[PDB]
Structures are given as structure tokens and as C-alpha cells.
Amino acid sequence: MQIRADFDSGNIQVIDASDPRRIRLAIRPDLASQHFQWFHFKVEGMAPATEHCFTLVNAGQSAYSHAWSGYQAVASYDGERWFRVPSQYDADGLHFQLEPEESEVRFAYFEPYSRERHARLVERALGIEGVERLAVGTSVQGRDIELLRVRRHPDSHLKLWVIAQQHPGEHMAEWFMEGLIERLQRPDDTEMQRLLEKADLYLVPNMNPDGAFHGNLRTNAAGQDLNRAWLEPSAERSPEVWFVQQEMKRHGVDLFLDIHGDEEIPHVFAAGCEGNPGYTPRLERLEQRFREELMARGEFQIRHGYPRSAPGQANLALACNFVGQTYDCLAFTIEMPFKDHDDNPEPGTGWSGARSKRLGQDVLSTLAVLVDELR
Ligand SMILES: [Zn+2]
């Protein structure tokens, strides 16, 4: 048996794989930061009719170690069909078991979104009516940060922004973007016709290509948490954010959605700008409308989430808060679970790429309903 992670988004350190009943592995810290939680590795040469038992020995020292409870690892024999495996968490770490039907299998913290798939997503987007690559930024390591614009009418007046995966380990984020973009291929989509008559979409499928490729969880190549870099961005340390901010200054913003994934909470939720000094009655109302409409259409709830910010106590270094206040627009962080969306249990897969894609499509329906109220 051999274990490796020498591929896009791979992350693992092999401790000892000599005994199938006691496979010991360790998660690797981010390129330039102590954070870690995301893991992705491949196993080959496994013996048939043999139970294999894995342990991520340093799970207890991960960035969000409390989030391991209730979490089931994801696996795949072909890289296309992903399924959850029996998992437990204790002082020795995260454990999971599988009696593989095949000699090779891969495991990951979430269904991975490769940079190769990303290129295909962009390729597909550019083949869609009204879609153009408006601008392209460059990451610390030279990778592209495409900003796509969906514009089908020269007289639209609203700019709706959606960016994803600032935190590289939250792969559900780009899956959400794939679903959103793929919906644009539909003929006779009445809701989208209405939306695009009044608005243009500004999309960034992946905000941290370096981190994703390298299997990071939280930071870009330089070790910066991009979602804490908005108040003081740097063309050198956080070029990904510097880029988006420059483009926002050029075009304007009337709506902002920052797509993320949360390790702990087993529910899809959205966090707003209630702590912003600029949190006006207008924005408070729009936040209610957004949640009300999305809850009626997609896998989304309003009971569970992050503790709200006291009036005026928001951290303006976070994208949602920064963009919302700078542009006086409706702004949310959309958070999808690494576990399952417990309101609609599907244990075999837990939250998945497919469900992330669907949420992207349901969010589009929600935007179509609110477009007349954004300004
Ligand atoms: Zn995040």
C-alpha cells in the first residue's frame, strides 16, 4: 500500500502505512501559516476484503478542532462519485474506516475542485452568451484570478458581485460558482431574463488559486488570510484582494456575496453586516428580504449561524463588511457546511458539490426576486 498527495490540492504527511488496521497520517500546515484542517490524499495497492483504518493523528491541533465531532470524511474510487465514510473523533485524532471495493481510493475533507476543472469552468463560461473575461488579476505565484462579467443588455444599471473561495480549503465555494455559471446556459430562463435586463453579474470563481492548488486551508501563498485583508490590502501580500478592490472601484457594487464553507456548523447560513457603522434601516430590510426569499427556494436556514455583531462593532477587515459599507450595498457571506445541512439529511454524501451547485442556482432565483429593491 502507498499513500501520496502529490497533486492539485493534495495535503497529507504519511507517518506509517505498514499496517492497514493502523494507518497513521498527519495534516500538513499551510505553506506560510500554522493553519490546517483540509486534507486530500490517494491510497493505492490496497488489499481486497480488508478493513483499512485511518487516523489523522494531529487533528486535535487543527485550526477548528472542535469541528471534527459529527464530521464524516469523504472518499472516492474514481474522483467523480464521492461518498462519506464512518468517522469518529477523540484524543488520538480523527478516525475513519473503509473496506475498499477497489485497490485505490482517495479521501478529502470535501469534494475537491481542481484548478484544471476551474480552467474548464472558465472555458465554458466564455462560451456562454453575454459572458466575457472582464479582467484578470495575478496571484502571489502568478496564477490567474478571472473576473467574469455577465452582461446581456447595454442598459442594465446594477452590478451584482459574487466572489468565492477566499479560504482555499472551502472547495464547496467554487462548486457553488459552477452551478451559478452553468445555469446561465439555459434557454428560456425567465427569471434570469428579468435579472439580466436590470443587472450585470461580476463573478470571481476562485479568489485563492495558489492556496487551493497547494492544499491550504486558510491562507494564500504569502500566509495571509484573504478575508482579513480588506481594510488594508497589499499588492504584494494580498494581490488577490487588491485586484478585486481595484475592479470594484472601476465598476461599482450594488450587491456583494462572499461564498465560503464552515467546518463547525451543519447548516447552510448567511452572515450579514449588522455590525457595520453604516448598517442602515434600508440594508437591514434588504437582508431580511434576501433571507426570506432564499429560505423559500434553496437549502438555507436562519436558525443557526455565527453570533451577531453588536451595533457598530463589525470587523471591517472582512470582505462582506468592508464592501457593504464602502459601497452601501446589500452584502452577505454565504456559508455551506463541511458536514451536512442537517435540515435535509443525506448522510450518504453529506453536503456535496452537487448541492453546492444547486444552492448557487437557487441564489440566482433569489437575486431575480430582489433586483428591483437593491437600489
Ligand atoms: Zn471561509
CATH classification at residue 75:
2.60.40.3120
Q: Are residues 14 and 142 in the same domain?
A: no
269-271/330-337 β-pairing: antiparallel
| Residue whose C-alpha cell is 494507518 | 23
CA 262 / ligand 1 centre spacing (Å): 6
Q: Are residues 235 and 149 in the same domain?
A: yes
Which residues place a Cβ less than 5 A from the ion ligand 1?
Answer: 167, 170, 260
| Residue whose C-alpha cell is 483499512 | 52
Q: Are residues 40 and 84 in the same domain?
A: yes
Closest listed residue to residue 6, CA positions, set 236, 214, 210, 207: 214
Q: Of the residues 93, 113, 133, which one is the last residue of a structural domain? A: 113
The answer to whether 260 is a known ligand-binding residue is yes
Mention every residue, 6+ apart, whose C-beta is less than 8 A from residue 55: 22, 23, 24, 25, 92, 93, 94, 95
The Cα angle at residue 343 between residues 342 and 345, in degrees rounded to 5:
55
Q: Are residues 44 and 126 in the same domain?
A: no
Instruction: Please tell me the chain's helix, strand, coil percentages from 3-state DSSP, rounded to the nearest 5.
Output: 30, 25, 50
Side chain identity at residue 59, one-letter code? A
Q: How far apart are CA 258 and CA 171, in angstroms?
A: 13
CA 269 / ligand 1 centre spacing (Å): 12
Q: Any idea of the CA torsion for 204, 176, 265, 212, to the nearest 10 degrees?
A: -50
CA 348 / ligand 1 centre spacing (Å): 24
Q: What is the DSSP code (8-state) at residue 59?
A: G
Could you tell me how far CA 162 lies from the centroid of its own chain?
12
The Cα angle at residue 268 between residues 267 and 273, in degrees rounded to 5:
120
Closest listed residue to residue 163, CA positions, set 111, 230, 109: 230
40-44/74-76 β-pairing: unpaired
Mention every residue, 6+ apart, whose C-beta is less than 8 A from residue 63: 35, 36, 37, 217, 218, 263
| Residue whose C-alpha cell is 428591483 | 372
Q: Is 113 helix (H, G, I), strand (E, B) or coil?
A: coil
Q: Are 283 and 321 in contact (CB under 8 A)?
A: no
CA 87 / ligand 1 centre spacing (Å): 23
Q: Are residues 264 and 315 in the same domain?
A: yes
Closest listed residue to residue 290, CA positions, set 367, 190, 200: 367
What are the C-alpha distances in Å from 179 to residues 176, 306, 309, 354, 356?
A: 5, 25, 31, 8, 7
Its domain, for residue 69, covers 1-113
Q: CA gyration radius for the chain?
A: 21
Q: What grid cell was written down for 255?
A: 450587491
Q: Are 173 and 121 in contact (CB under 8 A)?
A: no
Count Cα atoms within 13 angstroms, Cβ side, for 294. Answer: 22
The answer to whether 247 is a known ligand-binding residue is no
Q: Is 103 helix (H, G, I), strand (E, B) or coil?
A: coil
Say which of 174, 247, 287, 335 is annotated catalytic.
Answer: 335
The answer to whether 35 is a known ligand-binding residue is no
**Is residue 335 among the annotated active site residues?**
yes
Question: In the chain, how many domains are there?
Answer: 2
Q: Are residues 40 and 130 in the same domain?
A: no
Side chain identity at residue 174, one-letter code? E
Q: Are residues 102 and 195 in the same domain?
A: no
Q: Phi-psi bin for 351: left (phi > 0), alpha (psi -120 to 50), beta?
A: beta
CA 239 / ligand 1 centre spacing (Å): 18
| Residue whose C-alpha cell is 439555459 | 186
Q: Are residues 164 and 17 in the same domain?
A: no
CA 319 / ligand 1 centre spacing (Å): 11
User: What are the DSSP calls for 159-202, one per residue?
Assistant: EEEEEE-SSTT-THHHHHHHHHHHHTT-SS-HHHHHHHHHEEEE
Q: Of the residues 94, 113, 132, which one is the last residue of a structural domain? A: 113
Burial of residue 164 (number of CB atoms within 10 Å: 0-12, 13-18, 19+): buried
Q: Are residues 221 and 206 in the same domain?
A: yes
Side chain identity at residue 282, one-letter code? R
Closest listed residue to residue 221, CA positions, set 240, 246, 245: 240
- Resolution of the solved structure (Å): 1.6
User: What are the DSSP calls for 217-241, one per residue?
Assistant: SS--TTS--GGG-SSS--TTT-HHH
CATH number of the domain that residue 345 is part of: 3.40.630.10
Strands of the sheet containing 2-4, edge to edge, are 2-4, 40-44, 105-108, 74-76, 83-84
Q: How far apart are CA 284 and CA 232, in angstroms?
A: 26
Could you tell me how far CA 232 lies from the centroid of its own chain?
23
Burial of residue 281 (number of CB atoms within 10 Å: 0-12, 13-18, 19+): exposed
Q: Of the residues 49, 78, 113, which one is the last residue of a structural domain? A: 113
Q: How far apart are CA 155 and CA 43, in angstroms?
A: 54
* Angle between helices 239-251 and 319-327 in degrees, nearest 10: 20
Strand partners, 158: 199
Q: How far apart are CA 114 and CA 102, in angstroms?
A: 23
Q: Are 49 and 84 in contact (CB under 8 A)?
A: no
Q: Are residues 206 and 317 in the same domain?
A: yes
Q: N- to C-terminal Cα distance for the chain?
A: 60
Strand partners, 107: 41, 75
Count Cα atoms within 13 angstroms, Cβ side, for 60. Answer: 7
- Strands (E) across the chain are located at 2-4, 13-16, 23-26, 40-44, 52-56, 74-76, 83-84, 87-90, 93-98, 105-108, 131-138, 144-150, 158-164, 199-204, 255-262, 269-271, 330-337
Q: What grid cell was written down for 60?
A: 486535535
Q: How far apart are CA 225 and CA 230, in angstroms?
A: 10
Q: Are residues 158 and 291 in the same domain?
A: yes
Mention every residue, 6+ apart, whose C-beta is less than 8 A from residue 375: 157, 158, 254
Q: Are residues 363 and 291 in the same domain?
A: yes
